[PDB]
Coordinates of C-alpha atoms in Angstrom, one line a residue:
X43 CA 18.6 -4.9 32.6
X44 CA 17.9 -3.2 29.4
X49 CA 9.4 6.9 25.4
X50 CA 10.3 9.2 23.7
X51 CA 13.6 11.0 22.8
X52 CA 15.0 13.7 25.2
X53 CA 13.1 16.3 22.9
X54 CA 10.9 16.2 20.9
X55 CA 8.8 18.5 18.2
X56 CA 10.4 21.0 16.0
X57 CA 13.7 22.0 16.4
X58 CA 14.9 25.2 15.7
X59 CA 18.6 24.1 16.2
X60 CA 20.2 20.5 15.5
X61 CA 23.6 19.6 17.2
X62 CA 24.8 18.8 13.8
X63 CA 23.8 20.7 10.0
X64 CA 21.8 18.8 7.6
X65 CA 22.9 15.9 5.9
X66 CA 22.9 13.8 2.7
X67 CA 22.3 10.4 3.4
X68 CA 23.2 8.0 0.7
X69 CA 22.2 4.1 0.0
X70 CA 24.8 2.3 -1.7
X71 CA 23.7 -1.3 -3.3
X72 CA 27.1 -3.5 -3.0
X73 CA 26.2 -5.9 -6.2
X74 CA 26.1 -2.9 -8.2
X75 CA 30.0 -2.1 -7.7
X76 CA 32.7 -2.8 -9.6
X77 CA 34.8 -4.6 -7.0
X78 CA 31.9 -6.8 -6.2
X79 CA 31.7 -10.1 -7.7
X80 CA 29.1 -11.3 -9.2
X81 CA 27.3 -15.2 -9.7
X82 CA 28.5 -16.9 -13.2
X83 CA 25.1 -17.1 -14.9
X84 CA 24.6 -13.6 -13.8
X85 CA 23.2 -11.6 -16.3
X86 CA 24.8 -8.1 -15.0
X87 CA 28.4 -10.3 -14.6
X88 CA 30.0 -7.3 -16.9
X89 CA 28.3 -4.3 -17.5
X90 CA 28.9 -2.8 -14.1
X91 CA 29.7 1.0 -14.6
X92 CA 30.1 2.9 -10.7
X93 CA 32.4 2.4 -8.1
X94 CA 31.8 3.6 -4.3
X95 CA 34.2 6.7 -5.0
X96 CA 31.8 8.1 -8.2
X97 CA 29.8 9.2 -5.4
X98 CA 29.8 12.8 -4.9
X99 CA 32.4 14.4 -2.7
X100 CA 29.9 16.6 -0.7
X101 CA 28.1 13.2 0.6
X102 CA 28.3 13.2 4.4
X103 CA 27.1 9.5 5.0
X104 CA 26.8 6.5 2.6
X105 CA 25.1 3.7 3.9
X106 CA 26.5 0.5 2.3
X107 CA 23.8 -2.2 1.7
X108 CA 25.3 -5.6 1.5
X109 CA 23.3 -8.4 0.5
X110 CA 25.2 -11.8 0.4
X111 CA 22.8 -13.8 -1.9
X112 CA 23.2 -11.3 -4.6
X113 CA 26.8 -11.9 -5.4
X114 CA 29.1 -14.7 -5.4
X115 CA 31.9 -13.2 -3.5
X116 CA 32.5 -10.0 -1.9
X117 CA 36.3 -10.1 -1.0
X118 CA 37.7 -8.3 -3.8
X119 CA 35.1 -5.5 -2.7
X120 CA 36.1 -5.1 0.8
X121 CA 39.5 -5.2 -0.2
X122 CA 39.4 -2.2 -2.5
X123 CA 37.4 -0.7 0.1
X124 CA 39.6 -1.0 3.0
X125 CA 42.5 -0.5 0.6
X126 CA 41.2 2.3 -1.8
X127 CA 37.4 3.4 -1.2
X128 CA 37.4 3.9 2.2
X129 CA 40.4 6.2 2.7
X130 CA 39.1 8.4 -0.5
X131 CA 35.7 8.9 1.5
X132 CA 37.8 9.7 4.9
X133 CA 39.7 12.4 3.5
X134 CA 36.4 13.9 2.1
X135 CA 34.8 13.3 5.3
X136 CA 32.0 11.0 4.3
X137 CA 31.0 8.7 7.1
X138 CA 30.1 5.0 6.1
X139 CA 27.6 3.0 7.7
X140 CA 25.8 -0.2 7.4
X141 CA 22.7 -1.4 7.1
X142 CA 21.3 -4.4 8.6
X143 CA 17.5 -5.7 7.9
X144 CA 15.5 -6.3 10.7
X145 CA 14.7 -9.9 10.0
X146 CA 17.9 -10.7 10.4
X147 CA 17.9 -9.3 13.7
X148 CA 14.8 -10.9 14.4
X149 CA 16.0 -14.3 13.3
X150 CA 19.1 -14.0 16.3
X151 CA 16.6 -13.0 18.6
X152 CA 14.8 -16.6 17.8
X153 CA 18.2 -18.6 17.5
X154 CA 18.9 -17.4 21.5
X155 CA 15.1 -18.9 22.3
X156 CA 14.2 -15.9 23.4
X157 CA 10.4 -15.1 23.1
X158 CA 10.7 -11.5 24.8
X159 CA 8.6 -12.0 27.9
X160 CA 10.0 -10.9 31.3
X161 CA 12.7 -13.0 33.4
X162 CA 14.8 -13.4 30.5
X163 CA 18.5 -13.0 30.6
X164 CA 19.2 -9.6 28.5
X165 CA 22.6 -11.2 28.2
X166 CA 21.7 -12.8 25.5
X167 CA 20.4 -9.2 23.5
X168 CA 24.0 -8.1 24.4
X169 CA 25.2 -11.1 23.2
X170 CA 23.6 -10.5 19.8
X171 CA 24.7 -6.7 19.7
X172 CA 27.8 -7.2 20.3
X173 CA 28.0 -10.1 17.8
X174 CA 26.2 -7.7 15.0
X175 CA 28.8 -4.7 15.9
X176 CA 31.9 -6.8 15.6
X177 CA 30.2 -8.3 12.0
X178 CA 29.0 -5.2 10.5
X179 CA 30.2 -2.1 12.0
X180 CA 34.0 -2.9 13.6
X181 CA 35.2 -5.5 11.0
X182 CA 35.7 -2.5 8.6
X183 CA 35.9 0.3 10.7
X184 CA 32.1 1.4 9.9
X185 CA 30.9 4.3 11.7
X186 CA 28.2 3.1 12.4
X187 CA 25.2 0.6 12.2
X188 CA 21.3 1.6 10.1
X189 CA 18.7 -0.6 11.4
X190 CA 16.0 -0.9 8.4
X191 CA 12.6 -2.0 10.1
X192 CA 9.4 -2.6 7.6
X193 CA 7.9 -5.2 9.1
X194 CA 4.4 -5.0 9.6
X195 CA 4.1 -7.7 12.3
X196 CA 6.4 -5.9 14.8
X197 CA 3.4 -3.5 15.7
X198 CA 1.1 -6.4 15.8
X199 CA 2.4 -8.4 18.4
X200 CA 3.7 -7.3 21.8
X201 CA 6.7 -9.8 21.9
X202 CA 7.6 -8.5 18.9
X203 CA 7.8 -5.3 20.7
X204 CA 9.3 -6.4 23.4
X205 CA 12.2 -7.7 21.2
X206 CA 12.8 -4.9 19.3
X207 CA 13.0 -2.5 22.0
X208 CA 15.4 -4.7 24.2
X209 CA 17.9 -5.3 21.1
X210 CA 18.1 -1.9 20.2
X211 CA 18.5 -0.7 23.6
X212 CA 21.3 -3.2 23.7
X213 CA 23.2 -1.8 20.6
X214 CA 22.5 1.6 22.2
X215 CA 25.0 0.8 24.9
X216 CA 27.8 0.4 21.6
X217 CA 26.4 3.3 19.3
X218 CA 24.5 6.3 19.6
X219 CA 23.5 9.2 21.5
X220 CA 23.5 6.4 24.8
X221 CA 27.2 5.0 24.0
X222 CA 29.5 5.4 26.6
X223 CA 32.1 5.2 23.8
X224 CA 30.7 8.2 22.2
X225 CA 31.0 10.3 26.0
X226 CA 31.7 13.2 24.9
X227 CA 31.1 13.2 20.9
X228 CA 28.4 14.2 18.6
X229 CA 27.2 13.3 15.6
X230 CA 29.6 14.7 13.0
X231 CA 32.3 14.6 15.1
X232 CA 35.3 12.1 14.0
X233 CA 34.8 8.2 15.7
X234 CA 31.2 8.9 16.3
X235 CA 29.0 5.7 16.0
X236 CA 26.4 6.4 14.6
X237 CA 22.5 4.3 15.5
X238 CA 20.7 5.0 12.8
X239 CA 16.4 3.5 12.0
X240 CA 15.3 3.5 8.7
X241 CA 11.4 2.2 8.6
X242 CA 8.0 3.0 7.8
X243 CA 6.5 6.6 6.9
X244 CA 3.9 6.0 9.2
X245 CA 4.9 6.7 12.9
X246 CA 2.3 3.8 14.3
X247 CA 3.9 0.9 11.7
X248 CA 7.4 2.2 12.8
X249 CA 6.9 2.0 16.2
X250 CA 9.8 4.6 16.3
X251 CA 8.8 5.0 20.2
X252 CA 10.6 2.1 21.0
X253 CA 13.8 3.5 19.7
X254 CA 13.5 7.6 19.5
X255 CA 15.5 7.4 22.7
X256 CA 19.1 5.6 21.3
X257 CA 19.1 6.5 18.1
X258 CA 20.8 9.3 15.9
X259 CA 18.6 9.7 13.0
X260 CA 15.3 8.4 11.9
X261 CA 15.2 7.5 8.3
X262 CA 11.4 7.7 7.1
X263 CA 10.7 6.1 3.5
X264 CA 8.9 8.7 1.8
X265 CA 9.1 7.0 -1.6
X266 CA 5.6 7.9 -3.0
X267 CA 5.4 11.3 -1.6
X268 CA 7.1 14.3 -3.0
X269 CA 5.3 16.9 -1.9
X270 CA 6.5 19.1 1.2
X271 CA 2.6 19.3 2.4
X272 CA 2.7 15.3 2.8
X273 CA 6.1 15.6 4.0
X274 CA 4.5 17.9 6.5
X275 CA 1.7 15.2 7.2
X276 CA 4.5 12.7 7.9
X277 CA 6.6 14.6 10.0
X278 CA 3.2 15.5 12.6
X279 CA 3.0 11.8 12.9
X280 CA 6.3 11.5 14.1
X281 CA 7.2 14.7 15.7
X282 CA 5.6 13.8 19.5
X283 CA 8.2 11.0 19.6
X284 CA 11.1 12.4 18.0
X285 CA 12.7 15.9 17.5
X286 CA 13.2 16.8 13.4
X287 CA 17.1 16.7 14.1
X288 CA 16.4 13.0 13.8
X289 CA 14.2 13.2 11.0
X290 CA 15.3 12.6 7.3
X291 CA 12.6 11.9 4.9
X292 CA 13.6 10.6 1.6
X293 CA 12.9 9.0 -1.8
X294 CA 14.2 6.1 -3.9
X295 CA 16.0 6.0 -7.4
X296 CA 14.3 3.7 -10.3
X297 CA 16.1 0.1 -10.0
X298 CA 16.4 -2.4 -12.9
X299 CA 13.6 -5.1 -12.5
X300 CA 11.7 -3.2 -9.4
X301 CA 8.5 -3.9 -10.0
X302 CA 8.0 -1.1 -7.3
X303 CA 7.3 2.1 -9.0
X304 CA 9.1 5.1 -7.1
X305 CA 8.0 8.4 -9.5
X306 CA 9.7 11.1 -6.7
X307 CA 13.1 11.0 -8.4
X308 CA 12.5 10.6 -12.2
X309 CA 12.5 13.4 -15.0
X310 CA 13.6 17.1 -14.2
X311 CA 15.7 17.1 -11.5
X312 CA 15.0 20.7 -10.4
X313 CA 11.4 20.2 -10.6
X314 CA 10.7 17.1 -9.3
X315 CA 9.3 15.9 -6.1
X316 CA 12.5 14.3 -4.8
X317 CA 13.8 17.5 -4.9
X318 CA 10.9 19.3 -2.8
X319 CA 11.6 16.8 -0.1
X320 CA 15.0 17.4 0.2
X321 CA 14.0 21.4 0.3
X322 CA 11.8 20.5 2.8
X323 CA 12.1 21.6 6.2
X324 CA 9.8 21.2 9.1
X325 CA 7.8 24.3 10.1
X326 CA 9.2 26.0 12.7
X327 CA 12.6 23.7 12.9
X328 CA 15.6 22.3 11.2
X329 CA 15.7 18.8 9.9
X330 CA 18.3 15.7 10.1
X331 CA 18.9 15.9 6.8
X332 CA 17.3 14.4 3.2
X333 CA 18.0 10.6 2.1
X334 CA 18.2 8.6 -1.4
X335 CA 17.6 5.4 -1.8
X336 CA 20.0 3.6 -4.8
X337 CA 22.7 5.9 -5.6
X338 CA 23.7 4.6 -8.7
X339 CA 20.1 4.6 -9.9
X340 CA 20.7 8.4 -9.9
X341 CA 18.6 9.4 -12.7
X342 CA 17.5 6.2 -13.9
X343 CA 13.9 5.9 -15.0
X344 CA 11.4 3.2 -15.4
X345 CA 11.1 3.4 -18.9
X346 CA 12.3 2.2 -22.3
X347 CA 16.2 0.3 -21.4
X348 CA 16.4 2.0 -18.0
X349 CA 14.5 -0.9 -16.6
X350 CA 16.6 -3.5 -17.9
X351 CA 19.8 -2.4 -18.6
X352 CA 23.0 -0.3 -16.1
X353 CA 24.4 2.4 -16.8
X354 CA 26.7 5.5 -15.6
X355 CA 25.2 8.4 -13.3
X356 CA 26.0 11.9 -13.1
X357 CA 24.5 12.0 -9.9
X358 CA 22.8 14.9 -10.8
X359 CA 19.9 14.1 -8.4
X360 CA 22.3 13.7 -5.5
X361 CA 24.1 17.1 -6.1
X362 CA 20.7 19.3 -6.6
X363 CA 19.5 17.0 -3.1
X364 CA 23.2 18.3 -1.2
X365 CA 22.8 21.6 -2.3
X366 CA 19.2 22.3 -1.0
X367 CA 19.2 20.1 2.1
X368 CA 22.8 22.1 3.2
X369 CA 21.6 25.5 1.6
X370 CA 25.3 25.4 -0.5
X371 CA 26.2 25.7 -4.0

């Protein structure tokens, strides 16, 4: 047998400091390897490690049908990437869309309706932890949720909340396996839920309870008043230790238009979010979509072409979201 979190509101103390969350896209690193009539087949310039070394998470965003093969990248990660980012004490996570999820759900015949057998939801969580999380020693799993048709229909509802209660019984703030251990602390697993900037198309109330961190995509925003705006939709069902708003690097071919993170890094809008904190309390932390985008724009090549990062963006982002230099 499987509202909101334990507190909630403003938080003028978190159980862990503020963090730099990091996306990392899998076809763009070297190790990967990419489809023959690829047109990015060379060309590929960063490799997980380039990240900085004052990261505390990476999220690693694996997308099968965008490579051919990825064994030559899990074996330089579980050979050289992932003992680099141990010793610096970056955790790694992974993120798994919702969809997928979704698509389990339907594979079990579940419809989500009562008298079901929430075997079946443990069934899939454990199948999704051993896949994604324990197959490379992952700390932990990020649930990414922008679908628009989860608040629409109850069943929908129903699903989500009984799957992620079921993985809150292998990560989070609800493991047993983490009795005992915080976030930050070493072999914490982390639940993380990445979704909507709106509180009412996240339905974050269905999961403020088992998860660690809620990952709000504030990609158009950049300024701490909206910021602001955001976090009073969400702060009645979470507390802001769980809150990480956020912003999204240029990609090549995007079609998207994310204008936080481009130009001067010290004045731009990516860089008020991550100064941002919530009146009155302490944040999770500050959040960046496409790493090695970092500092990419949407003009001229930068749209069409790769290149190298200084991670400039990322470093200004670690310094004001940790207060360090």
């Amino acid at each position: 047998p499987l509202g909101q979190a334990d507190k909630v509101g403003a938080q003028a103390t978190c159980a862990a400091k503020p963090i730099f969350f990091g996306y990392y896209r899998t076809w763009r690193d070297k190790a990967i390897e990419l489809n023959d009539g690829d047109k990015w087949k060379d060309k590929l310039h960063t490799k997980l490690t380039d990240i900085p070394e004052q990261v505390d998470m990476v999220s690693l965003f694996h997308v099968p049908d965008n490579q051919k093969s990825d064994q030559r990248f899990w074996e330089t990660f579980d050979k050289e990437y992932h003992p680099t980012l141990k010793e610096r004490g970056t955790k790694v996570v992974r993120t798994i869309g919702a969809k997928l999820l979704l698509n389990k759900i339907k594979e079990k015949g579940l419809y989500g309706q009562s008298r079901e057998d929430d075997s079946k939801y443990r069934e899939i969580a454990h199948e999704v932890y051993e896949e994604y999380v324990a197959k490379h020693n992952l700390d932990g799993l990020d649930v990414a949720m922008a679908l628009r048709e989860v608040e629409k229909y109850t069943n929908l509802r129903w699903q989500l909340r009984k799957i992620m209660g079921a993985f809150s019984e292998l990560m989070g703030p609800k493991a047993p396996g983490n009795a005992g251990k915080k976030p930050g602390d070493d072999g914490y697993k982390y639940l993380i839920y990445d979704t909507f900037d709106n509180a009412q198309l996240a339905q974050v109330a269905l999961v403020a309870d088992v998860v660690d961190y809620v990952l709000a995509q504030t990609y158009d925003k950049g300024t701490e008043e909206s910021i602001t705006r955001v976090w009073n939709g969400f702060r009645d069902k979470i507390n802001s230790c769980q809150f990480l708003a956020g912003y999204a690097h240029p990609e090549e071919n995007d079609t998207n238009r994310f204008l936080t993170a481009i130009g001067d890094v010290d004045t731009s809008g990516a860089m008020n979010v991550a100064a941002w904190k919530p009146e009155g309390g302490e944040k999770g932390g500050t959040f960046a979509y496409a790493l090695d985008r970092d500092g990419r724009t949407y003009d001229g090549d930068d749209l069409t072409t790769l290149k190298p990062t200084d991670f400039a963006f990322t470093k200004r982002a670690i310094e004001l979201t940790k207060g360090i230099s």
